[PDB]
């Protein structure tokens, strides 16, 4: 694949999470699309990194729900270590590093991932990178 395998990695990495975190996906996560009334691609990717970041910290290495079941306790520091890894990938694609997010509707992790995915499957046509 000439394109950047990183993209496919983000989708799979972002997906696997959905399969694992299905119930805990009720921690009402702040949206950001509301400000999509006029933003560029980069601005989007960045804004996405901000949401993911805060989401990581808020829960940090605290097994509040990200696990408490199985294959999650041990892979706890692994999920976080991976989440950040993705953030770094976003930085590469992005380049702003500074992007604000105006609150609005409190979506849900799953909903956030689902929405983000759509945008991914949409821009997927534009590999570039």
UniProtKB/Swiss-Prot annotation:
GO cellular component: extracellular region; extracellular space
Subcellular location: Secreted
Membrane-crossing segments per the record: none
Domain of life: Eukaryota
GO process annotations (BP): B cell differentiation; cell surface receptor signaling pathway via JAK-STAT; cholesterol metabolic process; dendritic cell differentiation; immune response; interleukin-4-mediated signaling pathway; macrophage activation; myeloid dendritic cell differentiation
Keyword line: B-cell activation, Cytokine, Disulfide bond, Glycoprotein, Growth factor, Secreted, Signal
Record note on what altering residue 9 to A does: About 500-fold lower interaction with IL4R than WT
GO molecular function, one term: growth factor activity
Paired cysteines (S-S): 3-127, 24-65, 46-99
Keyword Cytoplasm attributed: no
Ranges in a coiled coil: none
Glycosylation sites: 38
Description of how the protein assembles with itself and partners: Interacts with IL4R. Interacts with IL13RA1.
Disease as annotated in the protein's UniProt record: Ischemic stroke: A stroke is an acute neurologic event leading to death of neural tissue of the brain and resulting in loss of motor, sensory and/or cognitive function. Ischemic strokes, resulting from vascular occlusion, is considered to be a highly complex disease consisting of a group of heterogeneous disorders with multiple genetic and environmental risk factors.
Function according to Swiss-Prot or TrEMBL: Cytokine secreted primarily by mast cells, T-cells, eosinophils, and basophils that plays a role in regulating antibody production, hematopoiesis and inflammation, and the development of effector T-cell responses. Induces the expression of class II MHC molecules on resting B-cells. Enhances both secretion and cell surface expression of IgE and IgG1. Also regulates the expression of the low affinity Fc receptor for IgE (CD23) on both lymphocytes and monocytes. Positively regulates IL31RA expression in macrophages.
Family: Belongs to the IL-4/IL-13 family.
Annotated protein name in UniProt: Interleukin-4
Species whose genome carries this gene: Homo sapiens (Human)
Gene: IL4
Included range, full protein: 25 to 153 of 153
């Amino acid at each position: 694949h000439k394109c950047d395998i990183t993209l496919q990695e983000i989708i799979k990495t972002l997906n696997s999470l959905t399969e694992q975190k299905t119930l805990c996906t009720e921690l009402t996560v702040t949206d950001i699309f509301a400000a999509s009334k006029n933003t560029t691609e980069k601005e989007t990717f960045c804004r996405a990194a901000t949401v993911l970041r805060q989401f990581y910290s808020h829960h940090e290495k605290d097994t509040r729900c990200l696990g408490a079941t199985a294959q999650q306790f041990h892979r706890h520091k692994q999920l976080i270590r991976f989440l950040k890894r993705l953030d770094r990938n976003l930085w590469g694609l992005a380049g702003l590093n500074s992007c604000p997010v105006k609150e609005a509707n409190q979506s849900t992790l799953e909903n956030f991932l689902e929405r983000l995915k759509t945008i991914m499957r949409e821009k997927y046509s534009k590999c570039s990178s």
